[PDB]
């Protein structure tokens, strides 16, 4: 009965609902993921127990921070620290200066959170812009990876067909083939996001979802002129190593954190403003919210 007694519920933030709330004792504000637990199957009870366990384990500057896990009658509450910077992609389209260096800084933080997940045997499986939140500018504006409702626990490099999961534009070739998979599926999603961060449109796309899947399984993206002519070759190289259809050859999160475009940002990444990326990303964000 701890949540109904100690928290005041506010407006909705986004099989669950996320609502802002305030702890009545201290006045601190939080984000509460509310899950209806009535008439759940044994399989449903185990998925929710897995989610609360994963959220309790992951403590990292670039991951949402679990504050409390409260089980009342009919409902379960996962209470996180409230981040107020908004979605990452909405913050980028509001910038008047945005360069490769800024994209490298964003993807470095995302890579840090994915690396932290993989070191703890967790594969997120659903990396996408809607799961990339921001701390407030007054708090450092760190990128925050959110929502582990679809995450799985793996043993080292053990890989199997853990079933389907993910969002069409970010699905890896091995999941589309129904092959066994594991950690590299998060790195493929990181490659799609890095592509979007540079030009503001996705590398694989077709209004026909089946043709979208055909392009993904072929790994057939490209860097068309003119917008890619000003992108450094090192940035293109990192995308190449992330969007490799062979999951064994695909770069890992810790390997990616040592790529020169990541760890040598000020001397390798271009500092030129990319206005066309901001304009395309405005179109990208509009379609995603339908
Ligand atoms: C990412 C989750 N999922 C659903 C489950 C997507 C699809 C929906 N989106 C949300 O539920 C959501 C959560 C938060 C949020 C804010 N702090 N926070 C802390 C923890 C979490 C989560 C932890 C686990 C799942 S969500 N979400 C948030 N902030 C949101 N906003 C929109 C801009 C920003 C904003 O500033 N609006 C005043 C949306």
Swiss-Prot record:
GO CC terms of this entry: calcium- and calmodulin-dependent protein kinase complex; cytoplasm; cytosol; endocytic vesicle membrane; membrane; neuron projection; nucleoplasm; nucleus
Residues at the catalytic site: 126
Subunit field text: CAMK2 is composed of 4 different chains: alpha (CAMK2A), beta (CAMK2B), gamma (CAMK2G), and delta (CAMK2D). The different isoforms assemble into homo- or heteromultimeric holoenzymes composed of 12 subunits with two hexameric rings stacked one on top of the other. Interacts with RRAD and CACNB2.
GO BP annotations listed: cardiac muscle cell contraction; cellular response to calcium ion; endoplasmic reticulum calcium ion homeostasis; long-term synaptic potentiation; negative regulation of sodium ion transmembrane transport; positive regulation of cardiac muscle cell apoptotic process; positive regulation of cardiac muscle hypertrophy; protein phosphorylation
Activity regulation text: Activated by Ca(2+)/calmodulin. Binding of calmodulin results in conformational change that relieves intrasteric autoinhibition and allows autophosphorylation of Thr-277 which turns the kinase in a constitutively active form and confers to the kinase a Ca(2+)-independent activity.
Natural source organism: Homo sapiens (Human)
Lineage per the UniProt record: Eukaryota, Metazoa, Chordata, Craniata, Vertebrata
Keyword tags: Acetylation, ATP-binding, Calmodulin-binding, Cell membrane, Kinase, Membrane, Nucleotide-binding, Phosphoprotein, Sarcoplasmic reticulum, Serine/threonine-protein kinase, Transferase
First-tier enzyme category under EC: transferase
Domain of life: Eukaryota
Induction: Activity is induced in skeletal muscle during exercise.
Chief location of this protein within or outside the cell: membrane
EC number: 2.7.11.17
Name used for this protein in its record: Calcium/calmodulin-dependent protein kinase type II subunit delta
Domain comment in the entry: The CAMK2 protein kinases contain a unique C-terminal subunit association domain responsible for oligomerization.
Family: Belongs to the protein kinase superfamily. CAMK Ser/Thr protein kinase family. CaMK subfamily.
Chain's role: Calcium/calmodulin-dependent protein kinase involved in the regulation of Ca(2+) homeostatis and excitation-contraction coupling (ECC) in heart by targeting ion channels, transporters and accessory proteins involved in Ca(2+) influx into the myocyte, Ca(2+) release from the sarcoplasmic reticulum (SR), SR Ca(2+) uptake and Na(+) and K(+) channel transport. Targets also transcription factors and signaling molecules to regulate heart function. In its activated form, is involved in the pathogenesis of dilated cardiomyopathy and heart failure.
